From a paper:
Mtb Decaprenylphosphoryl‐β‐d‐ribofuranose 2‐oxidase (DprE1) is a flavin adenine dinucleotide (FAD)‐dependent enzyme, which together with decaprenylphosphoryl‐d‐2‐ketoerythropentose reductase (DprE2), converts decaprenylphosphoryl‐beta‐d‐ribose (DPR) to decaprenylphosphoryl‐beta‐d‐arabinofuranose (DPA), an essential cell wall component. Multiple covalent and non‐covalent4 DprE1 inhibitors have been identified and showed in vitro and in vivo activities against Mtb, further validating DprE1 as an attractive anti‐tuberculosis (TB) drug target. When analyzing toxicity profiles, we noticed that many TCA1 analogs show inhibition of CYP2C9, one of six major cytochrome P450 enzymes which determine the clearance of 75 % of marketed drugs. Here we report the X‐ray crystal structures of WT DprE1, a TCA1‐resistant DprE1 mutant, and CYP2C9 in complex with TCA1 analogs.
KGaAThe thiophene ring is located in a hydrophobic pocket formed by Gly133, Lys367, Phe369 and Asn385 and accepts a H‐bond from His132 Nϵ2 (3.2 Å). Replacement of thiophene with other heterocycles or adding bulky substitutions resulted in reduced activity against Mtb (data not shown). Only a fluoro substituent on the thiophene afforded an analog (TCA481) that is 5‐fold more potent than TCA1 based on MIC. To better understand the basis of the activity increase, we solved the crystal structure of DprE1 in complex with TCA481. The structure reveals that the fluoro group forms a H‐bond with Asn385 Nδ2 (3.4 Å). The fluorine is accommodated in the pocket with stronger hydrophobic interactions with residues Phe369, His132, and Lys367 than TCA1.
Residue numbers in the entry: 7 to 268, 284 to 316, 331 to 461
Write the structure that this text describes.
Amino acid sequence: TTTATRLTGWGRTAPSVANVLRTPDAEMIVKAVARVAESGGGRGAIARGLGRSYGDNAQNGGGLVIDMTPLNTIHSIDADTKLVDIDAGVNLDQLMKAALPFGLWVPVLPGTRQVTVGGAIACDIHGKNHHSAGSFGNHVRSMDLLTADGEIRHLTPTGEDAELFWATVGGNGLTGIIMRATIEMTPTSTAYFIADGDVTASLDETIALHSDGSEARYTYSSAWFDAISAPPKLGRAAVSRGRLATVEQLPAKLRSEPLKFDANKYTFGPIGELWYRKSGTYRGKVQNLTQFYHPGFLQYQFVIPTEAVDEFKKIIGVIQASGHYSFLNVFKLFGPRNQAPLSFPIPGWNICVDFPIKDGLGKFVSELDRRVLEFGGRLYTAKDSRTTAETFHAMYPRVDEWISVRRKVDPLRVFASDMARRLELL
Ligand SMILES: Cc1cc2nc3c(=O)[nH]c(=O)nc-3n(C[C@H](O)[C@H](O)[C@H](O)COP(=O)(O)OP(=O)(O)OC[C@H]3O[C@@H](n4cnc5c(N)ncnc54)[C@H](O)[C@@H]3O)c2cc1C
Ligand SMILES: CCOC(=O)NC(=O)c1cc(F)sc1NC(=O)c1nc2ccccc2s1
């Protein structure tokens, strides 16, 4: 029934051997969880999606890992209610394609589409539209949760079991296995975006641009920022902002299938500064999803609360002066948070940086953790593999509330992961 497999997260880092159960049969999954519960709990079980977490949240050294990707039935889509009913192994690319002919858009897309619905709920994922749509869990109308006792619980965001619903959102698999969910989609009349592009010369400008009001005009917003240059070039950004196009905004060619989804010597001088400015400045460009959104290393992502703007500028300065060079860097302003205790996003300045593994890096990121903590921010568990229990607990002050929900639903510690043990969420 199960195979011994060396599993890792996407950062190809911290390997651990587990029994991997890979079955299309939901029955077998129920029986395997019963097999784990009866056998004195042991080192437990965790669900796995497409393995796109950089962390260790989808591995369980010496325990059971349940591969959820063969549970990938789309049960129903309804254009009138905007509801899709899917198995938790359905991925967001598959969902996106199935839903478009109904005029329905996946309401939160992350930077990849190769992500399961289960993983999208359990990490409470966010994307380019967070300030207008919130995160994934805001759009879940119901889910079916396989709990430790072997019962499948039907959960909704309001009414009884709300607490457990909200513990499962961002719960990293630790309340049990999400089998099935109903999601409310966003109505759209096209597969396209109308996009504006802006380019700033400085961090001060980047911040000014993001707090001048203009963010209200766009449903989707994010930036690539410079993390290497000295100040005041540092934190200069290519900003890309837009919204879903309506049919009347498309060039005539596209109106018949509006829902179809099918170095050099100059580059470091003044001319390329102009090139990159021109090329990155535009208004009302029509773009598909690939052009607008989806075109060794240690990923590190954090958010600093909105008011702590001076503290945010200080952390960027520390990154640049550190001697650790990050080329691919995403900046976004998050909007309001939801009610999930372990949900990562909070209103404020979100950054994802990417460091090549060098001497000293492990210790440098520890200092960064400390600064993020002091400034009221937190790290994202989907990107993290190395932070301590202490640091994590102080960054998520609702963790105790969460833990008691978890102990209520899982008394025998039937659901467990490397991360759980490391972060003392067990
Ligand atoms: C290139 C790239 C870009 C990314 N961009 C973004 C982004 O823009 N925004 C963002 O928020 N995230 C982003 N991520 C992270 C990714 O969205 C999350 O890590 C997502 O959770 C991965 O889903 P997955 O199905 O691979 O789940 P896995 O990585 O396999 O599992 C992740 C967690 O979900 C739990 N889980 C999975 N399935 C189930 C289930 N059926 N029931 C209960 N728990 C389950 C696992 O136990 C584990 O805790 C990115 C990742 C990559 C590689
Ligand atoms: C590749 C898609 O890029 C985007 O447009 N991203 C966003 O808009 C966007 C907005 C946010 F709030 S968080 C985010 N993206 C991320 O967190 C990514 N992390 C990686 C790591 C490796 C490769 C690609 C990515 S994208």
